[PDB]
Amino acid sequence: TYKYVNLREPSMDMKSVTDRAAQTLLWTELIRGLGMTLSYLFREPATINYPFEKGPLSPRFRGEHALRRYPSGEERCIACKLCEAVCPAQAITIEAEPRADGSRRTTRYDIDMTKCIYCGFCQEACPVDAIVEGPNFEFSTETHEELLYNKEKLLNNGDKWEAEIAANIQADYLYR
Amino acid sequence: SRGEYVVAKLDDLINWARRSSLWPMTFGLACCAVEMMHMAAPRYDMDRFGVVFRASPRQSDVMIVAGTLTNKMAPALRKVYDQMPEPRYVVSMGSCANGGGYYHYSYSVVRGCDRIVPVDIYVPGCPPTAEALLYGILQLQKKIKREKRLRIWYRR
Amino acid sequence: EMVRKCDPHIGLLHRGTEKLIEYKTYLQALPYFDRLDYVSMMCNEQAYSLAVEKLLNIQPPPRAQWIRVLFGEITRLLNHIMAVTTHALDIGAMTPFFWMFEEREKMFEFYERVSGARMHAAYVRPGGVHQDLPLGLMDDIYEFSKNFSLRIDELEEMLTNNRIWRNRTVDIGVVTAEDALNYGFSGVMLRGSGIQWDLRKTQPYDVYDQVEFDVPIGSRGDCYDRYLCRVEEMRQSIRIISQCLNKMPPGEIKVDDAKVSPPKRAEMKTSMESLIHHFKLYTEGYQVPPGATYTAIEAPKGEFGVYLVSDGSSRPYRCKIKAPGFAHLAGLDKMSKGHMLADVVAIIGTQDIVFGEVDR
Amino acid sequence: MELLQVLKRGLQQVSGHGGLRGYLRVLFRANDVRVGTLVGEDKYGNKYYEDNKQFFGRHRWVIYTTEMNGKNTFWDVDGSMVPPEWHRWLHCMTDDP
Amino acid sequence: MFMINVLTLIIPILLAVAFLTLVERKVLGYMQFRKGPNVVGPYGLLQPIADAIKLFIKEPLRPATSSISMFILAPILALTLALTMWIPLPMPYPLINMNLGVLFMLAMSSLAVYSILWSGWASNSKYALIGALRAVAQTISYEVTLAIILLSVLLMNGSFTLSTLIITQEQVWLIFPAWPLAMMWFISTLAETNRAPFDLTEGESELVSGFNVEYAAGPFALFFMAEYANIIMMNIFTTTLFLGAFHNPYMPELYTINFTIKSLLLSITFLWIRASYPRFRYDQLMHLLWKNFLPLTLALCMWHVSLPILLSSIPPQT
Amino acid sequence: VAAFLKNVWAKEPVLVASFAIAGLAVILPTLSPYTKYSLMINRATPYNYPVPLRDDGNMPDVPSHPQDPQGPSLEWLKRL
Amino acid sequence: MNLMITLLTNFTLATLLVTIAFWLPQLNVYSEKTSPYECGFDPMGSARLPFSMKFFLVAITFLLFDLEIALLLPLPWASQTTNLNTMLTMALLLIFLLAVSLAYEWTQKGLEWTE
Amino acid sequence: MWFEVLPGIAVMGVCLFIPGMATARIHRFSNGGREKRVAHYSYQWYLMERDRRVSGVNRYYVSKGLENID
Amino acid sequence: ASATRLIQGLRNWASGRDLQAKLQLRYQEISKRTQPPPKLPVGPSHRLSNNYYCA
Ligand SMILES: CCCCCCCCCCCCCCCCCC(=O)OC[C@H](COP(=O)([O-])OCC[N+](C)(C)C)OC(=O)CCCCCCCCCCCCCCCCC
């Protein structure tokens, strides 16, 4: 159930002593290493041509946040604050009130994308699939406060990426 | 005029020379150093973009703060940044280098390296993918491309 | 250049993880562990999960145990690729770095397909795992593992027989066995010194007593035997991965107590008890019975332990994190007595240190 | 000999991009010369190509448009220019364009 | 018109250095299963121009603590000695035909150490001084065999003349009678030029950048191009020593193309050894060139003294 | 001496090759028939001018023309 | 004459690549960028302290073997002499004396480094 | 694939083919369509200075054969 | 996989192993990106009888 790495005594007949001395004087293993490096020289390299080719992803992928809507236009967030209660970085800040037609909807729904740890607890705690963590990951900013998303930026990410988020959730939701 | 054309083509020349020869310094801090190494890995391969490691700050262009900046290494980050020649740039990688991150309310975390160094590009993620870090580097190259150094100098 | 004293000042990545754990629930404290040993994410998840399940008096299903062992061995391949390739980078051979990070890229794709994030998964949770394996993932794990042996073979072709590599590792950083135990070394830092000890054999957890593998033991306590132990642990990790692919059971992937594991979303949205349990788990969290435990597993750096103190509430009272790298970096002071600056770099290489878990 | 077949494959990649001018176009805009099965095009001009003989990562690419939303993207191509219906297929989230 | 001859020597061997940076990065890329630079030009052919323009428009950064006269005088001497070791090299006719050109090459090999040496000392930093004295610990190891190997290879030539070393190898390559001297000379030229596995001065992982850890861009380019000029010059010198080609006196271009492709194969061999090996500890360097190469080199020196006497094969000095 | 020779070839083969090459270089020029031709070629190479002598009358071996039958000949160099 | 022109040209466009490197870019000098580099933190003491040489006996012996290649160097010329047994004997005696010196420095552990 | 290194090497080869070939041409331009007269030894320099004297135009590469004598 | 048999043979000679049997580049043999919808099994306590929580 155990093995001894490096416990081989070298043979001491004239054949193997001459082989080790030719290895010392004629550098067998150094030519072996050069042969392996030359063997990787003649290969097709694994470099994809980004930004024209994209690395492979799964429909489970956790990128930029987005608030979804029902297939009626009504947004799914009903202000229940499970996503900010489960959020391990406390990046989510929610404040709500009953709106003009008496519905439990949010007024403030902020996700600080510089606190957020992209772990997808908010999308798996959300009981109505409102907040999801979408497939975009190329959303770098030149300014720090552009990564402080309010409700309007999250709703625009939802209305931007819904045609892809709906298909990822459609391919994935049976595992949840 | 003629001189506007001269300084415009010289700006395009020096912006090309500075965006297609970015030499980042070997500077990781935390988990994001692993994904910065994967941005150097043979799949994504920074080196094809002219983006190659130089170990000393004197011989490097952009400082990728990749990881968590604590209170104990904030002056080390600042003196590394100061010992970079101008033009020097900063790419912020990961949530802790952006805004404090997962350790935001900690007693010993500098809440973002924008408190310490001037930051050009913010790359978001915990960690951002190496594809997203390469996106941030290409957006830094786009930011260098539209600089107007000699055009403003000829117009000042 | 003969080194007389090393003083490793650390705390440059100390972020106060285990005080932030005191103010968050157990599910909110789980993604701190991915960020301790940032090349051994699911191993730290598995250690914290075994600690919380030990305090909760519950156990995972069989499939979640085999998933934990399969991805812990994928994690062991990740960590020993990182160890060997950065050690050869620090000695000077920067080539198998690039050769083995393609394989490490493909195992990050396995993490991305199983959990959605490439590095920090938050996947191995107290109660099993979060989400079941997607279809065709095990076939691609097989297609990876069938070919990874030649990658280890060509790494070993480049470095093991090489005389420049043997000149940098063989008389360097010798650790005697009694000073290995008396410094709290663990894992390969014991096994390079010839000590017959491995936590997956002596204190067996989830289904490691049901798999068959061999525990590589060194003979001279140096950097070269620890190198060979890491390479052979990659070999035996491929062996355990083959045994886990062949012997995967069907069934569920969470413990079927819904007062610990969250219920499924297809039955959270239909049942009332399941909605109440979903609510109270993702807001309050499960109450852990009070008491302390020290749960230590064989992370690929060594004994990784969580000393977890619970006080009856849904938050940890205290969570001490024993990392292998802390005691190993304490032993760096002895190991660098009688070497040089070009050997202290190789000793920092042979002590596989990741400073998140060293620093918390 | 198969070396002349390599030179023929090079010449038919030259002839495949619409002549030498289009070959120089895709070379200096892509740093990539290979031809592919033109799967699709969006409402902007992004040409989406397959080649299932290439290895997994080179097998689906996009040649971006030259003018999207009023920006001259002939050289300033951006990875975020892909619309979300093709962002599944390009990032290999699906087999279906 | 001789000034035109000097300029047509020294400008193409700066452009050869420039495109050697591209060749180095792409061959190092494909040997490491990645690609090299291929974005900046057509398959990377314009990357060296950007790498060259970028360094002469970046801030020069003379340090505070530096001895500024020596700090600026060291890369000047580096690039000067990088250029002036090409002038006796027969291509098939050298720029400056010296009777004693081999000892000129050896003396300017010895003088080039003061570039690294005064640069590491003058930039008053600690890693710079460590690299500057590891340059001493490397130079006292390679110079104490670099003379005897080069002495023994000229005992079959007849003189210290590089131009006669083409007439000498008209029948056979000189790597056939002196392949131990050749495979030891090649390692001594590896250790001479601070190329891997003998980097040890610009040691990226022991030191930060070693002797030029303070040299920011502009003064840093004249060590980078000096090192690459030394490797191209040194592979050309090794080609002239051991792999000499056919010289048609009416067609010098046959010899020029032939030793050009041979010296390119030797430079690719430098890049291919750099992409495969770990790096020495610099005592194991000193316990190599003194304890392994020097006794065998003295034995081969006795052999190549006594062997032309033994076989009546003493070469002419004329 | 033989077991020690295999032992030192197993320990320090570089030194065995060094002493072997040095020993051959010492002893083997005393075992060559060609070593005479080395010094003969060296003393048969006319660097300086072969200064003529005044013919007093009695020098039958000193020639009067460079193509005379008498004098030192280098046909052994052409044949070898 | 041509050698001095070549050396002056090489020195000239070595120092013409330095004066277009200092006088071309834009400088922003302040008293932290020109500080000594010691990996982010301050150097504990100056670099002008005695940096002790451990390879010192080998460093002296370099000077006594560097004279040997001032003695052994005319061997391509000294083979052209007409006193060849004596030349061969003195040549192999000088390489043998170098080898006896190296063997004595071997056995007295002088090529080994201190500490 | 690998053959993309073959352009850059070629350019470096061009940059190593330019100097030596050029000086060959230069040694045939300023020396009358022939090689440059090699004076490694002082006797060769005396013959070369004799050629410079007998040429009549103070150039050593101007040759005078049997047409110069009567 | 498109490496010609001269380069393929030189590459196998230089490595010393058979490389086309074990390629580190992935091709058509890997799983489909679009998978069929699954049916995950329920645990042991998904029962309507003899399933009290206290036991
Ligand atoms: C110029 C064109 C190319 C030339 C050929 C070279 C191409 C290949 C290059 C490969 C990459 C090398 C990179 C650097 C490697 C550095 C390490 C290294 O190799 O160190 C040297 C190594 C060092 O070995 P080591 O490191 O194991 O040292 C052993 C030390 N002890 C024992 C104390 C542990 O080998 C040598 O020193 C060998 C030198 C050359 C030997 C030549 C012998 C010729 C034959 C002599 C006669 C033998 C028979 C006896 C007489 C018979 C008479 C009939």
Ligand SMILES: CCCCCCCCCCCCCCCCCC(=O)OC[C@H](COP(=O)(O)OCCN)OC(=O)CCCCCCCCCCCCCCCCC
């Ligand atoms: C009055 C008239 C004179 C006025 C003064 C100007 C003098 C000449 C200055 C040089 C030429 C000016 C133009 C510079 C480039 C401007 C155009 C440009 O930037 O085009 C962009 C394009 C690269 O696009 P990119 O975004 O990188 O592509 C991504 C890949 N999909 O770019 C390209 O495709 C090619 C870019 C080429 C850059 C220039 C070529 C290199 C410089 C050579 C000359 C200078 C150096 C000489 C030698 C010095 C020593 C080495």
Ligand SMILES: CCCCCCCCCCCCCCCCCC(=O)OC[C@H](COP(=O)(O)OCCN)OC(=O)CCCCCCCCCCCCCCCCC
């Ligand atoms: C001994 C041999 C030494 C050889 C050294 C050089 C080796 C490499 C040679 C060059 C190889 C090809 C390089 C091509 C680069 C890309 C050219 C190009 O197309 O640039 C486009 C750029 C922008 O064009 P624009 O009009 O803005 O495009 C918008 C279109 N809607 O437009 C521009 O940037 C403006 C035009 C710039 C053109 C620069 C081309 C390269 C010049 C390199 C200098 C050397 C020239 C030859 C010297 C040796 C021979 C004398």
Ligand SMILES: CCCCCCCCCCCCCCCCCC(=O)OC[C@H](COP(=O)(O)OCCN)OC(=O)CCCCCCCCCCCCCCCCC
């Ligand atoms: C006749 C011609 C002139 C011969 C003398 C001149 C030779 C010139 C060549 C250069 C020699 C320079 C260096 C010589 C050093 C010899 C002493 C030596 O190294 O002894 C120690 C060595 C064992 O090494 P160790 O103790 O381990 O060293 C510490 C590092 N590990 O111990 C050994 O390795 C054993 C050394 C002694 C026995 C060597 C036997 C070699 C036999 C080869 C065939 C015969 C060749 C003829 C020469 C006579 C040999 C006895």
Ligand code: SF4
């Ligand atoms: S992904 Fe995690 S850190 Fe980010 S908002 Fe959601 S719960 Fe919070």
Ligand code: SF4
């Ligand atoms: S996003 Fe979901 S979990 Fe958060 S408050 Fe809205 S409905 Fe509740």
Ligand code: SF4
């Ligand atoms: S932002 Fe997060 S994942 Fe990234 S380095 Fe920081 S702690 Fe690690």
